[PDB]
Amino acid sequence: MKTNSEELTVFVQVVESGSFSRAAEQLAMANSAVSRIVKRLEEKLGVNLLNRTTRQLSLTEEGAQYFRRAQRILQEMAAAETEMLAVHEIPQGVLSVDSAMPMVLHLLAPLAAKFNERYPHIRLSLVSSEGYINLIERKVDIALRAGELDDSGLRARHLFDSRFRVIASPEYLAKHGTPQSTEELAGHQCLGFTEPGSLNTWAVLDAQGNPYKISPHFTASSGEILRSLCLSGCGIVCLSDFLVDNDIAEGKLIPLLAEQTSDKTHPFNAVYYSDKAVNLRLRVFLDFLVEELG
Amino acid sequence: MKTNSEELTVFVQVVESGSFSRAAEQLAMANSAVSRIVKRLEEKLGVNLLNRTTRQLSLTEEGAQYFRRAQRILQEMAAAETEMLAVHEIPQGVLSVDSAMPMVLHLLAPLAAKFNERYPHIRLSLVSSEGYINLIERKVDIALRAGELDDSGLRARHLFDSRFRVIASPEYLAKHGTPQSTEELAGHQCLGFTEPGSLNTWAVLDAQGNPYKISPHFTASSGEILRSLCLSGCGIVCLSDFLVDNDIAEGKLIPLLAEQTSDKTHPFNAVYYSDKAVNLRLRVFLDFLVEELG
Amino acid sequence: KTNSEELTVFVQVVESGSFSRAAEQLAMANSAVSRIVKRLEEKLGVNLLNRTTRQLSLTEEGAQYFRRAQRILQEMAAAETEMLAVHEIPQGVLSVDSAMPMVLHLLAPLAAKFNERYPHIRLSLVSSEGYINLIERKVDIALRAGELDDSGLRARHLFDSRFRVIASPEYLAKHGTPQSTEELAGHQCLGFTEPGSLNTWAVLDAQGNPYKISPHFTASSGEILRSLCLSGCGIVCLSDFLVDNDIAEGKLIPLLAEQTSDKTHPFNAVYYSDKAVNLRLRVFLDFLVEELG
Amino acid sequence: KTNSEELTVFVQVVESGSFSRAAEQLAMANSAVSRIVKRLEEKLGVNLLNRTTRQLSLTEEGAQYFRRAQRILQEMAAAETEMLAVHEIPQGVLSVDSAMPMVLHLLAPLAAKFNERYPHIRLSLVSSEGYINLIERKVDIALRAGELDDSGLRARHLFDSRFRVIASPEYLAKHGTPQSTEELAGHQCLGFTEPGSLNTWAVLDAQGNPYKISPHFTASSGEILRSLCLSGCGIVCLSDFLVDNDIAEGKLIPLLAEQTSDKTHPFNAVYYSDKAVNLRLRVFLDFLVEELG
């Protein structure tokens, strides 16, 4: 093990905190030092992590593959620290997590039985709103959202990456047939969101290679409603993977245009206020959360 | 034939809209004028519907059986009113429903399949919200809400009735015991709502004959969340029967305290504007909903 | 915004001959009947009737809402009768002359449930052919697929029913299943003894004409035919309620489903108006309208 | 607030026996190693040391940080090899010397997947009993239930395992299922030939001590004791990995599930520090830790 935390932290800093210059200032260090250690890291690793040929230094396929592990090492290190901190310092008090309805049902609910056995002293308070209004008002403590519009000095925590899907019920397929291409999606039944075309642009690519927009028959607000409608056989809906993965494993929803669907994932991340980070009750939950959903 | 729809409509109101007083209030009529009618309605049938022996009037054994008939008459009268309104007009356009998550997932979702085919020109918009604010602002057309705080001139069309059912998981009960008495509940995990003392007052009669008030450990802000907490062994929870009657039939959930749980039924209704009742689109959706959940 | 006071007036004017005559039965003027009838088809949003003719006619919208409006008013009376029979208990012998297959496949099953609800009515289920017993008052209420009730006596709609050509699976296995209506002429087809009246089935051919059969076996009843059919004697065609049950159990197979007519035929209890005040008769009918349809 | 150097000290100190014995394998002063563990405990604020025991014992609280600190380092070493892997396609012979049970139960089934993943590594699976040939460099790596590897030959932690007392349904039918640890005395128990060592089963008697079986049959290998158990020769106590799937198939039945101890014992790979330059080795370890961990 020729690497250390000091350069696994530093490297992970550069990526997330913009680039080289913004990380040096962030971690109370010189730029000269930030390059020295990172160039050493990629030197001793034997591979080139990031490119200087990008305007803003972007990670290579190799260096990105490292970063995801580089994160978990620092995370479950930091997490295992908290674990020990809470051994003498009793972890208690109310905690509220405003999550999207699907995330609560499929992720939070089942694992909430295990969190109770570890920390039965923490009064959990799962809630469900719409925007980041609630999270910041301290009536909600932490927000589990797949949204990268978190930049108001607030803290975000990477929970998991997860790409979209496109699926339909067996009922619908047996009667209305299957779309061979994405252009045949014009002559089928669609499932989109109530919001003004924000998520209605799917992760499937048309003959041009552009992200395929749609004309929704039904417009459900929540992601779970869409799922229950697509289960029932109201048409074809596009959602995130975790929300519908098991049903593909079951057989209740059959994927189509599997080759056309783009594979670029979107990060789901628990956002919170920086001064609430000193509270152990928040910490123990985040350190509990990111680990259970790799 | 002697009974007139006027007095049938008076009777169906007074029953499901509380007592003698609260009915006349909602129907633009005096209590002296309303009870004049209903007293005549009894004394031509030769039988006693009301029963004011107890504090609030309740239905006699015969008084309820006339209600069941009384309601359907007025229902499928309105349906044939509708059936003709959709002769020289046709149901087309965006229909924006604002329902509680429990309902859209369980009731609407598996019925959209049917509702789709019959009215394929209707663009259904399944939205969801906490308050009635949106509907007042007419950004949603119709809201399905189990709430009887709608004495606002805006119509409140009954849909169905629902008993509560205290339920747990077979993993939870077989690994934390099954409470026999209603006093043994204090030592079991009791999941409730996030709202201070609202529905956390469970409808299960204690040893004195009163609704059981619960100190909630977990506090979920939705009925559907409380289900998936309980379904995966997090504590026993009290919700409406339609939400979980299917699960307990499958055998994945267990009914708790059959005798000590109350039998009176909570009415759910689709509330909306009086002026927006003239919409053939909105009319055929409430017609569909009554004659699919009854 | 509808009401009984007007729904009753429309349900009268249709069945009560012409507009002028409807006012005579309801004990109200012709100035009244026009006001409320015109007001109903105003608040329905449709023109129900057509008064260009000397005798008012039914526009399909008016004729459909009628067969709804009727039931609403039927139910509304059934509701009242249901109460009056609380403290004025219906009792005694109520005889019900009925077509053998109606008794066996509809009544018999429901009888216990009706027994329960009104234990003091001793039913007397019987069978005859004509309307001779009923018109002579030897029976209280006749159950028929019966339009021939032109003799002043009342008729109450129970249910409309489709036809279904079928055959036993063992016959179909041993004689093959016909793919066409004209293919029937090869198979063994069973019909009624009554010359040709009912042996033009409701299964259209290439022409679009309902198929006549030349039967070799002839029973005098739908029930006997049903029994022959089940034993694999041939193909019959009967009403849906005789055989729908056996389709479920898989003892009979639907034949020529697409070629089989979708038109339905009505069933009625027929009885006397003066016998309409019979509180038990009334309750038995309300019971059947409830269970069937 | 922690760092990697102090994890890698603590994890050695614990797993490498003594406190002074770690520093001479870690290439550090006994002064410096104590400074670091005193530092680590300071910033964590929890005892990992238990100097009250002759040898340093793991604080039940600090014992958790070890198995957390152990993985971090394992992962942290996988990231590296993973990066190195992209350049060099690892090849040649890799000699793995394991116990007959580990090979037949852990490697054998996972061999397929590894084969596909690095087709140019020609695995050679052997089985010797000592660390003789590991030391002579006639084998590259040895998987053991090894808590006695302390000759400056760095050892990696594959997995922790529980014991289980189990027996054949055939045997249990013919000799009954014992409800208490004392009842074993009448049942026949099958143990190791090697004087009394693994004849102290991980199931506690009423007192609180373990049980000491007095075996009639004596097999030399936990795999033979597995085949003897299956044939219903009697009750045996082996590690969980050696029997879990037979319990999964209902071919073996678990006994005394409650009196059985929930304490785990470790299996470790054993190779030279200088042979961590291999990619063939590194990737096979990274594989074994990943699949079964």
UniProtKB/Swiss-Prot annotation, chains A, B:
Entry similarity comment: Belongs to the LysR transcriptional regulatory family.
Notes concerning its domains: Each subunit contains an N-terminal DNA-binding domain, connected via a long linker helix to a C-terminal regulatory domain.
Any one of the GO BP annotations: DNA-templated transcription
Protein name: HTH-type transcriptional regulator CrgA
Induction: Negatively autoregulated.
Coiled coil region boundaries: none
Limits of the HTH lysR-type domain: 1-60
Keywords: Activator, DNA-binding, Repressor, Transcription, Transcription regulation
Function, in words: Regulatory protein that activates transcription of mdaB, encoding a NADPH:quinone oxidoreductase, and represses its own transcription. Under the same experimental conditions, no regulation of transcription of pilus and capsule genes is detected.
Free-text activity regulation comment from the record: Activation and repression activities are enhanced by the addition of alpha-methylene-gamma-butyrolactone (MBL), an inducer of NADPH:quinone oxidoreductase.
Organism, scientific name: Neisseria meningitidis serogroup B (strain ATCC BAA-335 / MC58)
Alphabetized SUPFAM superfamilies for the sequence: Periplasmic binding protein-like II, Winged helix' DNA-binding domain
Subunit structure, as described in the record: Forms oligomers. Forms an octomeric ring-like structure in solution. May form hexadecamers when bound to target DNA.
